[PDB]
């Protein structure tokens, strides 16, 4: 058995579905059977958060959650606390976390100290991925995360229709964003670069600068090449209404 589903109860929190994947490199992973068992069988619009971690973006996440609610979109992140959780819980949004099982901790009952890599309350579905040797690190789950996103957007094969729209939101609050951006560009997916992280602020600043004035101090050369090849959209706002308008636009229309 390549995967096993569980009911996961967050301490003082919601009941989630937790799926352990025992081999992330398994050829032809049975996503159809997995998603049928989770009742995730419709095609859903997807908002994928790239490099999501704990950040001071509170009102921005309220706008993002509103746009996802109005579009019936599933949010996909890295299963750790981001500050989106209160808005997701209140609106009954589907929040899907994908993480390596070895890189995350299970929440402790009545713990006075939250670990920054603890699974956050608000996730409705958790995908904990492993290799055979249980040595998986951050970025190695990224291929599984994108394949899951593509299958969630396609839904059941019997629905003859185009897949639902997928938008990526580059937060870059963690340094491990590069592999996920590389895969998003490879699948021709739109990427919203959101203000608030040092990496995103540098990208936005350099997008407005003339070529001769561009200074890259934090962004790797590979990311600079990806910015020319991919569909990147700069959001120089932390306003809840501006992110909601961007997400709603990209979930409804493809501008390229």
């Amino acid at each position: 058995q390549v995967w096993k589903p569980y009911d996961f109860l967050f301490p003082a929190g919601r009941l989630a579905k937790l799926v352990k994947v025992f081999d992330v490199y398994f050829k032809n992973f049975p996503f159809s059977d997995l998603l049928n068992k989770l009742k995730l069988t419709e095609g859903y619009p997807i908002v994928n958060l790239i490099g999501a971690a704990q950040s001071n973006r509170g009102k921005f996440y309220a706008g993002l959650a509103r746009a996802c609610f109005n579009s019936e979109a599933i949010i996909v992140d890295s299963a750790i606390e981001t500050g989106l959780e209160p808005y997701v819980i209140r609106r009954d949004l589907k929040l899907v976390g994908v993480a390596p099982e070895n890189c995350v901790k299970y929440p402790k009952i009545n713990s006075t100290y939250k670990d920054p890599y603890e699974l956050s309350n608000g996730h409705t579905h958790l995908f904990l991925v492993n290799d055979k040797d249980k040595t998986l690190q951050w970025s190695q789950e990224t291929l599984f995360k994108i394949q899951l996103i593509l299958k969630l957007a396609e839904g059941k094969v019997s629905k003859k229709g185009p897949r639902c729209k997928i938008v990526n939101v580059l937060l870059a609050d963690t340094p491990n964003y590069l592999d996920e951006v590389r895969l998003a560009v490879k699948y021709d997916l739109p990427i919203i670069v959101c203000k608030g992280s040092h990496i995103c602020d540098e990208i936005i600043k350099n997008s407005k600068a003339q070529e001769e004035e561009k200074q890259w101090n934090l962004v790797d050369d590979e990311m600079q090449e990806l910015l020319q090849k991919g569909h990147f959209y700069m959001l120089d706002s932390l306003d809840s209404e501006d992110i909601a308008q961007y997400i709603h636009f990209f979930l409804t229309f493809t501008p390229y």
Binding site: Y233, M234, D236, S237, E241, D242, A244, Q245, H248, F249, P255
Partner: protein, 49 residues
């Protein structure tokens, strides 16, 4: 505020789509923005004696 980095062609297409939704479905795809106007009103100087 002109903050949406959008090509004019897409801006017109979105407005036409909004007018179509507003006529057919009585719903706007444009989110309402608040406009605050300072208004000067007269109040009596009721002596707080």
């Amino acid at each position: 505020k002109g903050i949406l980095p959008m090509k004019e062609s897409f801006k017109y297409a979105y407005l036409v789509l909004n007018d179509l939704f507003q006529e057919q479905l009585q719903f706007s795809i444009i989110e309402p923005k608040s406009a605050t106007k300072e208004v000067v009103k007269a109040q009596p100087l009721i002596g707080i004696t």
